[PDB]
Amino acid sequence: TCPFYKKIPGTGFTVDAFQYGVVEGCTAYFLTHFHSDHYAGLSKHFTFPVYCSEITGNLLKNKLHVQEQYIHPLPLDTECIVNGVKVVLLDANHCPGAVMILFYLPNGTVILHTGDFRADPSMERSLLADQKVHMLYLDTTYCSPEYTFPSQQEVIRFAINTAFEAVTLNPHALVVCGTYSIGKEKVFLAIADVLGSKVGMSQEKYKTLQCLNIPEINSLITTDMCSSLVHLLPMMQINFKGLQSHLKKCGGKYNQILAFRPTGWTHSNKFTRIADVIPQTKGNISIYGIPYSEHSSYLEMKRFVQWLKPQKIIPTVNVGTWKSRSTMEKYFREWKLEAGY
Ligand code: NI
Q: Is the Cβ–Cβ distance between 118 and 296 less than 8 Å?
């Protein structure tokens, strides 16, 4: 059964609630983004209205084969009416097509559901500037001060400089980038741009990328692996055994691999600055873990919430343990006492 933090009170709406069968009283199912923990349960047999971004709707139709009659794509930054209730979708700064949802309830209550997000000061000049928010449904993934990591811009500078140096020293090197979901496309696109190459990948991953409305994408990606020196592979294959195996398949075109594993936060972020990061190496194979996050750091999250000044916060991540719930509630109260709301 559907938990309480996935239901929007005063409405017939749920958010990211497809794995519970038919939810009693739900007339519209919202999907914030195309990540499997959130879409879990959707398929071609789903027969209620799904509300989402255009990009999420392209993925639902082409990857999960949801029928078109049940997909309701909404434009961003635009007031829409769904089952008699005013809604707005806002860019979440997460993966492609990810949104936050503003609900203006009939009784005057205003609710913001962040979905998954990476808070940014640019959100302080969205359509949120105007107004009061009574309830915030918050992505609390990294809600503790130990969670630090660099800007996306610093991490991409490190990746492009590392890949450009390696291939300039060795023109016969191959670069590989792991993936297991949408998001983090800047990593492989920026590296291919500095090397003057298209990105090579499987037909399945190409299909996914073709649903994302990325400008000039046809100029940037390919299924012809042999024509490319930046390859995408499943994240599970980014290890010395899977990379050795891949190099065999390339028919003596390359004599070295440089590989990247974009992660979220890891333990080494407690100690090692991005500029100082080194790879794991075995023979002619090197593997870099790089902390490219699509969720808020602790500081980014705290800034956003102290700006917004919501009356009540409902966490949507780390809700399963009493220790996590207590820790999050203590930080919410600190933030409220410090800022005076
Ligand atoms: Ni996500």
A: yes
Domain range for 169 is 148-295
Ligand 1 ion: residues within 5 Å (CB):
35, 116
Tokens, residue 252 = 């003596």
Question: 182 C-alpha vs ligand 1 centroid, how far in Å?
Answer: 9
Q: How far apart are CA 57 and CA 109, in angstroms?
A: 28
Reference 41, options 59, 61, 22; nearest CA is 22
CATH number for 220: 3.40.50.12650
DSSP 256-275: EEEEEEEES--GGGGT--GG
> What's the number of domains the chain is made of?
2
Q: Do residue 278 and residue 322 come from a single domain?
A: no
Ligand 1 mean position to 115 CA, how many Å? Answer: 8
CA–centroid distance, 298 to ligand 1, in Å, is: 17
Rounded distance between C-alpha atoms, residue 11 and residue 84, angstroms? 10
Give the Cβ contact number of residue 180 at 10 Å. 12
Asked if residue 167 and residue 133 are part of one domain, the reply reads: no
Q: Are residues 33 and 92 in the same domain?
A: yes
| Residues 240 and 301 occupy one common structural domain | no
Q: What is the dihedral of CA 257, 261, 262, 268, to 10 degrees?
A: -120
Is residue 325 within a helix (H) or strand (E), and if so which, with residue range? Answer: helix 322-339
Residue 169 sits at φ, ψ, to 5 deg, of -70, -40
Token pair belonging to 93:
């700064």
In DSSP terms, 72 is beta-bridged to 51
The alpha carbon of 85 and the centre of ligand 1 are apart by a number of angstroms equal to: 26
Cβ contacts of 104 within 8 Å, gap of 6 or more: 85, 86, 87, 110
Beta carbons within 10 angstroms of residue 146's beta carbon: 9
Q: What is the CATH number of the domain that holds 100?
A: 3.60.15.10
- In the structure encoding, which two tokens stand for residue 305, read together? 């919430």
Residues 265 and 287 in one domain: yes
Residue type (1 letter), 330: K
Q: Do 5 and 141 sit in the same domain of this protein?
A: yes
